[PDB]
């Protein structure tokens with residue numbers, strides 16, 4: 001959890017606090033890492049972030065190496081060389097539909113685990129799915145994430161409104177079902193090859209559209225089954241909206257179906 005700064009080697013910027021690629025000399029190897037670096041509230045956020053990641057043990061969730069205090073406060077995590085899913089698909093338009101399915105199923109597996117762990121993510125978007133390889137996705141960015149109280153199935157709170165469920169907007173209530181809503185948006189982005197959802201619309205206009213029972217259209221080349229899954233994620237009523245255990249299963253099965261044809 002606590003790291004020796006002199007074992008860390010930063011490069012002179014992935015994004016902009018800032019995220020920078022670095023090297024942490026480990027027990028025997030040198031490990032490539034991503035380092036989140038800050039510009040009191042800001043410092044406690046980072047430790048809260050680190051506390052959440054510490055509690056999570058799953059192949060489809062970014063792993064924290066530890067925290068560092070030097071020039072600035074620094075959060076050191078495993079590196080995802082291919083970066084954010086939305087950018088990847090934007091620059092790689094010929095990624096196959098099967099490959100996209102495989103990646104979003106991987107995200108659902110990570111989310112299924114987060115649910116069983118009683119954590120809400122609250123920033124689940126394609127920008128926060130990071131690619132270790134073209135066939136290996138991990139969930140990142142636990143800056144807004146909350147551990148649910150033992151006696152509550154939701155957390156009561158700028159928001160990424162286009163990814164938030166009606167109950168988040170209407171009642172400030174975040175649950176795993178809210179994350180499922182965000183996952184639908186993320187699915188939409190993945191099949192739209194990393195285009196922004198609700199193009200040209202303001203936050204308030206989105207809320208209005210959703211209130212009328214309208215949902216985003218089926219992306220070009222997206223299988224009807226995956227668009228059916230998207231819309232089910234976008235179930236307005238929280239009770240009728242599926243959980244991640246159901247979602248992961250629907251994706252597991254349809255991925256295995258598609259794989260079977262790739263041979264047939």
Ligand SMILES: COc1cc(-c2cnc3[nH]cc(C(=O)NC(C)C)c3n2)cc(OC)c1OC
Pocket residue numbers: 014015019034036062077078079080081082083084087127128130140141
């Ligand atoms: C390889 O290209 C990029 C890679 C990354 C990146 C890679 N590995 C990571 N591990 C934890 C991260 C992390 O905490 N990321 C937060 C920014 C979500 C994180 N971000 C981020 C990028 O832009 C943000 C990139 O595009 C230049």
